[PDB]
Structure 1
Amino acid sequence: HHWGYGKHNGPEHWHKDFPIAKGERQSPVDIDTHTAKYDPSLKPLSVSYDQATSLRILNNGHAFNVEFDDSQDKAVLKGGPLDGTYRLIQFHFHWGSLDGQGSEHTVDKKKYAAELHLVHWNTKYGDFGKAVQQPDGLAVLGIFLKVGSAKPGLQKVVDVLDSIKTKGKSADFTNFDPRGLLPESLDYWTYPGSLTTPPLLECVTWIVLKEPISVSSEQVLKFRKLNFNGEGEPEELMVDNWRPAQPLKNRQIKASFK
């Protein structure tokens, strides 16, 4: 009886196995744009993905992850609110059953069709597993998706999804350039938070870009054909794999922009 996003094992149940679900710095949150304050102390954000080496794409039963070689400082996130160097290890998405829901963060309570999370770990902790035990261990770059024009840089991901339909399937996924998933502007909001899936560890500096990327209806329809189940199990479509907004508590959301 494992956690998931069904009626019986969804986010409202997670606190029974993971009591930190009701903690002081949980994610995601609603970003109230009128309350977020410009912070002139934020240093410029540095997304350096030119040498990123993707390896594999995996259906883990909760989402699909594109994994990177993180055994040296090829693809790194620095600057903004961050101290030191954060290495890209994987990206994944959260999405809905309908275009009006799917994002984890919300903006003035608006839900987007989907949300991309580029996950990075603080190299001062040596490995990912040590980093998630630290309050500044991870930096997640969050990017909203809205349905409109196709995103050409997403199509290589969309076209491999038929090969990883079910939980536990993986496929080789080399030479994918995550620069193709970024919006034009790097203006962002930032706050201290958590993983949005169990174990819900409070280890993340969140950096949420203001400008959404546009994907086509056909692109997101292909996400919604994935399965939560393994092969040879009853088919359950992988949709609505998002955690709703959590209490902000004793936190301030800071804006990089005026």
Structure 2
Amino acid sequence: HWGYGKHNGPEHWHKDFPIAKGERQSPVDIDTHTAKYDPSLKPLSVSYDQATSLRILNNGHAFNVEFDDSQDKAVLKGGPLDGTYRLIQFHFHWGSLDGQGSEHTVDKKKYAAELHLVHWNTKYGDFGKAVQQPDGLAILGIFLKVGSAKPGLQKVVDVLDSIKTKGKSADFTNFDPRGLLPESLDYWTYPGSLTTPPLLECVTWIVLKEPISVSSEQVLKFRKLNFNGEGEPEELMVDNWRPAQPLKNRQIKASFK
């Protein structure tokens, strides 16, 4: 019964998920001055040409755009990564107001939202096994700020009325996630965790520096979703972000000077 409410939110999660207080929890604040350029890092390789979106699901905490991950069709490689990681889903975290919503922060700055493209390491054969490994997942994080519209986001926004409440899904084929990427692939990277229960410490985080712009109207539509199920009291799905966690014995590396 974890969530983001007044009485089941992030500060409570440790009771059911004690790793919430672990050594490699996410998100974190990215202190840009102390992140060090690492010339050994390689460009990332984001290969989404063959991606097969299938469905969009309101799971009660966010909405997931789900992919076919039964072959290497949409893969993330390079950067800090050893080997090949399959896109399984993307989702967002966002605020009730434009001044908040991101999970990672940059010199304590909160963005309006944050996109997570979740990929699992093909060495481990599927997702459930991958989350049990320290290098099981690679999550590409992309900040959203409010300004111009993101044209490539609009098809997502327009389907949200059909998945207003927890447990609703809709067909969502032929969506191209390349339309959610910023211009630059410059990034920060560090070892961390899932940001939702079970908070497993299985993620190589790759957080892009360049945000994407979305319009006020687009984020407003995110904020019309519901945490609740159909026929239940309405609870707007807003502020579904975990705050920054202690960095502990980690270094954040930059791909760029």
TM-score relative to the length of structure 2 = 1.00
Q: Displacement, 1:36? A: 0.2
Q: Distance in 1 between matches of 2:42 and 2:30?
A: 21
Equivalent in the alignment of 1:35: 34
Q: Displacement, 1:122? A: 0.0
Q: Displacement, 1:44? A: 1.6
Q: Distance in 2 between matches of 1:162 and 1:234?
A: 17
Q: What secondary structure is seen at the aligned counterpart in 2 of 1:230?
A: coil
Gaps of 5+ in 2: none
Q: Distance in 1 between matches of 2:182 and 2:165?
A: 30
**1:172-221 CA distances to partner (integer Å, 9 max, x unpaired)?**
00000000000000000000000000000000000000000000000000
Q: Distance in 1 between matches of 2:126 and 2:73?
A: 15
Q: What secondary structure is seen at the aligned counterpart in 2 of 1:157?
A: helix
Q: What secondary structure is seen at the aligned counterpart in 1 of 2:149?
A: coil
Q: Displacement, 1:71? A: 0.2
**1:88-129 CA distances to partner (integer Å, 9 max, x unpaired)?**
000000000000000000000000000000000000000100
Q: Distance in 1 between matches of 2:102 and 2:135?
A: 23
The answer to whether 1:147 aligns with 2:146 is: yes
Q: Distance in 1 between matches of 2:217 and 2:54?
A: 25
Q: Distance in 2 between matches of 1:19 and 1:84?
A: 30
Q: Distance in 2 between matches of 1:144 and 1:249?
A: 23
Q: Displacement, 1:253? A: 0.1
Q: Displacement, 1:64? A: 0.1
Contact 2:43 2:79 in 1 (8 A): yes
Q: Distance in 1 between matches of 2:69 and 2:86?
A: 6
What number of residue pairs does the alignment pair up? 257
Q: Distance in 2 between matches of 1:41 and 1:180?
A: 29
Q: Displacement, 1:34? A: 0.3
Q: CA RMSD in A?
A: 0.2
Q: What secondary structure is seen at the aligned counterpart in 2 of 1:34?
A: coil
TM-score relative to the length of structure 1 = 0.99
Q: Displacement, 1:43? A: 1.6
Equivalent in the alignment of 1:169: 168
Percent identity between matched residues is 100
